[PDB]
Amino acid sequence: HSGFRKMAFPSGKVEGCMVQVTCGTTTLNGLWLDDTVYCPRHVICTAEDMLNPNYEDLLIRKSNHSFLVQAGNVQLRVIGHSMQNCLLRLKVDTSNPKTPKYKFVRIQPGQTFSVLACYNGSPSGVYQCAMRPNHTIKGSFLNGSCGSVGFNIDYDCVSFCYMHHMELPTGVHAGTDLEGKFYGPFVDRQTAQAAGTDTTITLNVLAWLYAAVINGDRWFLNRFTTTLNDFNLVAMKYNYEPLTQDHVDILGPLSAQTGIAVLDMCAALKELLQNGMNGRTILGSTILEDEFTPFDVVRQCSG
Amino acid sequence: HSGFRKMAFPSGKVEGCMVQVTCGTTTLNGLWLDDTVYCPRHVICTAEDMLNPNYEDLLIRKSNHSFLVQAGNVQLRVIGHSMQNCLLRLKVDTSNPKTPKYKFVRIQPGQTFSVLACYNGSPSGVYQCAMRPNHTIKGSFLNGSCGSVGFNIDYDCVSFCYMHHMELPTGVHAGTDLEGKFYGPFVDRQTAQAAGTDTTITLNVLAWLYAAVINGDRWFLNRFTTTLNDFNLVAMKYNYEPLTQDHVDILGPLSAQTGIAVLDMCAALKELLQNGMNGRTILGSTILEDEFTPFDVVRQCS
Ligand SMILES: *[C@@H](O)[C@H](C[C@@H]1CCNC1=O)NC(=O)[C@H](CC(C)C)NC(=O)OCC1CCC(F)(F)CC1
Ligand SMILES: *[C@H](O)[C@H](C[C@@H]1CCNC1=O)NC(=O)[C@H](CC(C)C)NC(=O)OCC1CCC(F)(F)CC1
């Protein structure tokens, strides 16, 4: 039992920032940082506006007095409002005393983050997930979950990277960064939008193989190597993402810890793809995991 | 379609209670509730002591001044101490305003809880665990993690059920309730301890198969049915826990949601046990998952 486990970041710093935002009877979640509340702009939609909302026209009919923002049941009065891409920015009359040190970041495909799933401004649960190559997430969300956020924590600083907006017909999820710019080609309206065909996150498969070596499972290592270009051409024929120069460097620490060169681990993965596992397991499993990152492996080696 | 994830409870209410406890050069985590700090008693051991500790002897050799308790950058003054089973209770001269409504619960095998893994008094990660039938937990704990706690939240009440103490040679973990009594046959000493042979938590496998159907993965359903007794015969043959009628009752709501009678899901599981998965996956897993309770599935899927 290796102890390598998917973990969420402790959510308390984000819990202290969750509020509910209501227009009429539509309620979703918002993020309260200093004296601003961020939330998805479709809170202003009625059922008849959802199919193809004219958000600019809808917001013309709205005043500060139209928005009910609550921390629990305590109202926070709105003193200003504007739209920023697919988000509303609501200025409120109170600076959140629980505001952590924070940044807004744009996540890249293959990277992971924690999601604090919230309903009516009340946190329900926290889980880890990855941004897929096709710019969706395999989340877990019910009605009322919009405005739940995704985040990473680095020491004392919360990096917010995702705000939740919609579900796609295949049951995966789409959303924006905290500037309101969607990840992927998606738009916030009540229409069926197909995601592109997904691929396997090669960087994380390689991390998982390094994790298996660290734990003493090494049957899949070989005495051969590959060039990066040759590997990437084979990868794409197996619907694996190509490796980038950044990916190779991210794997530096695991390569150094194990003494297995990145391109030698790529050669091992190429052999697994072409030959299959033919029965065997890796870290107790028959299929290769692709949502456990190099950062996760390294972090969980020692205390 | 909701999707389906291993989901922990939000950890904020517990994070506000974590402190660091040091005695000599041993440091671990404590739980600060009102004016009491709870922590594993082996904080009082040196390296040598841990091989065969006489804890009553070791503790009478300490005073209040022997314990350094720190809440971030602030030392808390220890003004009394006592031992209850394998925990220490340190009385401090400050009350924690962040104390949630709470209770102490001893959980039963099959039940799940969230773990807030902490190092040097600082929260690092949160994940979901089940109490195994053999009274271990398959955790992720490194040096410095002792005193990390497991918990559930109902309404606004935190039910603490686990405090972490040790790792076994197999890599699984053992600890206590918040009364200091170990789950299982384990003892807090630096020796290699084996657990009893584990079994699979049938009620949870069934709840997870229902979660799979709710999310549209239903290849394992079939036309067969079974009685409860004939299911339990096969279950026990395969080292699965028997199902009681009270357990069938618990699955009622998931049954009504999917329209799949509990005993029909049992017949599906019986076939999975006898035939294997034939290389197929359920909710992306190549094995039958038994660390989701019915409540965990309902929480997420309704
Ligand atoms: C917290 O103090 C610490 C947590 C463990 C360290 C590694 N993973 C853990 O979960 N607990 C311990 O170090 C205990 C202290 C004893 C006095 C109870 N000891 C422990 O976990 O030792 C694990 C060893 C035991 C011998 C072995 F061969 F089985 C290898 C594992
Ligand atoms: C906001 O809470 C909500 C979250 C979704 C509800 C169920 N799961 C979710 O993730 N968001 C929405 O309901 C959006 C609102 C738009 C105006 C942005 N709509 C949405 O997600 O539609 C989902 C449907 C639409 C396409 C489909 F018909 F193919 C099936 C999914």
Side-chain angles (χ1 to χ4, degrees), chain A residues 2-50 52-55 57-60 62-64 66-76 78-88 90 92-97 99-100 102-127 129-137 139-153 155 157-180 182-188 190-222 224-236 238-270 272-277 279-294 296-298 300-303, chain B residues 1-47 49-50 52-72 74 76 78-97 99-100 102 104-137 139-153 157-178 180-222 224-277 279-302:
Chain A
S2 75
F4 287 123
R5 212 186 227 276
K6 287 173 181 179
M7 307 193 186
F9 284 104
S11 53
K13 288 181 170 77
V14 180
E15 292 170 54
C17 302
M18 300 307 307
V19 297
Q20 53 183 321
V21 185
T22 304
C23 294
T25 62
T26 303
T27 295
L28 45 64
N29 305 281
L31 185 69
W32 179 22
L33 303 165
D34 295 316
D35 68 335
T36 300
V37 170
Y38 306 79
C39 73
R41 65 183 177 167
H42 72 256
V43 67
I44 71 182
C45 291
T46 184
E48 299 76 48
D49 294 323
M50 302 259 165
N52 195 29
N54 184 332
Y55 285 109
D57 186 293
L58 287 168
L59 195 59
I60 287 173
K62 303 279 170 162
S63 61
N64 295 330
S66 294
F67 294 99
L68 175 57
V69 177
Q70 298 167 295
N73 282 331
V74 181
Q75 179 175 11
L76 299 181
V78 176
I79 55 170
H81 65 279
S82 61
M83 179 168 306
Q84 183 188 10
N85 303 310
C86 296
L87 295 186
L88 302 183
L90 308 176
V92 294
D93 65 3
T94 310
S95 183
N96 184 357
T99 302
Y102 75 95
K103 286 144 49 173
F104 292 170
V105 311
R106 180 132 183 117
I107 210 74
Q108 296 299 319
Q111 283 166 349
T112 58
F113 55 94
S114 297
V115 171
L116 182 65
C118 291
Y119 299 94
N120 313 119
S122 294
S124 168
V126 65
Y127 57 86
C129 68
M131 175 67 65
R132 302 303 307 182
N134 69 1
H135 312 285
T136 65
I137 68 174
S140 177
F141 292 115
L142 303 164
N143 289 314
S145 60
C146 285
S148 297
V149 299
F151 62 98
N152 288 280
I153 307 191
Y155 299 102
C157 180
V158 183
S159 287
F160 295 103
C161 61
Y162 179 86
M163 182 160 271
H164 183 51
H165 294 241
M166 63 198 338
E167 189 183 17
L168 302 183
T170 60
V172 301
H173 295 104
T176 69
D177 65 20
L178 271 291
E179 293 176 330
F182 262 90
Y183 294 101
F186 306 110
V187 296
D188 53 341
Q190 188 83 23
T191 74
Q193 300 168 53
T197 66
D198 202 22
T199 46
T200 299
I201 303 159
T202 310
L203 173 67
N204 295 347
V205 178
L206 293 167
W208 178 253
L209 296 177
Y210 277 111
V213 175
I214 284 157
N215 197 47
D217 203 354
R218 26 186 200 256
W219 62 265
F220 49 88
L221 298 177
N222 66 42
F224 300 93
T225 193
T226 181
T227 66
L228 186 57
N229 183 60
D230 283 350
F231 174 78
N232 280 350
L233 293 169
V234 177
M236 282 184 123
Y238 285 94
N239 271 297
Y240 274 55
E241 277 297 297
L243 229 51
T244 71
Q245 194 75 344
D246 283 353
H247 295 166
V248 167
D249 295 331
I250 289 177
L251 289 169
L254 290 173
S255 178
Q257 182 185 348
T258 60
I260 304 162
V262 174
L263 286 174
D264 297 354
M265 193 65 89
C266 291
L269 173 59
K270 186 191 296 187
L272 290 176
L273 295 177
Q274 296 178 329
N275 305 341
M277 331 249 303
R280 292 194 87 159
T281 62
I282 292 175
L283 283 168
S285 184
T286 267
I287 50 73
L288 299 171
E289 171 64 44
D290 84 336
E291 289 193 9
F292 201 64
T293 69
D296 295 321
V297 181
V298 156
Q300 298 184 14
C301 279
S302 54
Chain B
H1 189 283
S2 58
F4 201 72
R5 290 276 183 179
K6 246 182 185 155
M7 193 170 318
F9 284 101
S11 55
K13 295 185 162 54
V14 178
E15 291 170 50
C17 303
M18 298 310 301
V19 299
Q20 183 173 226
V21 182
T22 297
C23 185
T25 50
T26 315
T27 297
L28 39 69
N29 307 284
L31 183 74
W32 177 28
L33 303 175
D34 298 314
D35 62 348
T36 303
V37 175
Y38 301 79
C39 71
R41 64 178 178 175
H42 67 257
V43 69
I44 67 182
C45 298
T46 76
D49 290 321
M50 288 190 304
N52 202 16
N54 188 314
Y55 282 108
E56 297 288 15
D57 282 347
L58 294 174
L59 186 65
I60 194 169
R61 300 172 187 157
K62 304 290 181 179
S63 63
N64 289 333
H65 197 286
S66 307
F67 298 98
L68 165 57
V69 177
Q70 288 178 114
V74 180
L76 289 47
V78 175
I79 64 181
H81 65 272
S82 65
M83 178 165 63
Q84 177 181 24
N85 298 317
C86 304
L87 294 192
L88 300 182
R89 299 180 293 188
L90 308 176
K91 281 286 164 184
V92 292
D93 60 3
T94 331
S95 215
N96 186 7
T99 306
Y102 73 95
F104 291 171
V105 162
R106 186 162 178 95
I107 56 160
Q108 301 304 311
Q111 298 190 270
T112 57
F113 54 96
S114 299
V115 169
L116 178 67
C118 295
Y119 297 87
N120 294 125
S122 295
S124 158
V126 65
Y127 57 89
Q128 201 72 351
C129 279
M131 182 56 61
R132 305 302 313 170
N134 70 0
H135 302 107
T136 67
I137 73 172
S140 177
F141 293 113
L142 302 169
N143 285 339
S145 64
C146 287
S148 295
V149 299
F151 65 95
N152 285 286
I153 310 184
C157 182
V158 182
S159 288
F160 295 102
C161 58
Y162 179 84
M163 184 162 269
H164 185 52
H165 295 244
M166 67 195 295
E167 188 171 298
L168 308 186
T170 54
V172 301
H173 299 100
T176 68
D177 63 19
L178 269 296
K181 180 181 166 68
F182 265 86
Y183 295 101
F186 307 109
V187 306
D188 50 342
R189 57 182 302 202
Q190 188 75 24
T191 69
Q193 292 171 55
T197 48
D198 204 15
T199 72
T200 301
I201 306 155
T202 306
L203 172 60
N204 290 5
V205 175
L206 294 165
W208 176 75
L209 287 175
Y210 276 109
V213 169
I214 293 172
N215 285 283
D217 210 2
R218 63 153 70 216
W219 67 260
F220 50 83
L221 298 176
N222 59 44
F224 318 144
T225 192
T226 181
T227 67
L228 183 59
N229 247 111
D230 296 339
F231 173 79
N232 280 340
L233 287 173
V234 175
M236 290 179 195
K237 184 186 187 196
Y238 284 89
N239 198 26
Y240 270 57
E241 295 189 326
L243 200 66
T244 71
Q245 181 63 46
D246 292 341
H247 290 173
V248 170
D249 292 353
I250 291 170
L251 288 166
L254 287 170
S255 184
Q257 173 163 1
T258 57
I260 303 177
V262 176
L263 290 177
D264 293 354
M265 196 64 80
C266 286
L269 177 56
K270 181 190 290 174
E271 290 309 297
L272 290 167
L273 295 180
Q274 296 173 320
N275 302 328
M277 323 244 314
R280 313 188 60 151
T281 67
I282 302 178
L283 288 175
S285 182
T286 54
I287 67 170
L288 303 178
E289 176 65 50
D290 77 337
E291 304 222 342
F292 297 93
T293 68
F295 165 95
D296 295 339
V297 177
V298 170
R299 169 148 74 107
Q300 222 181 124
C301 288
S302 320

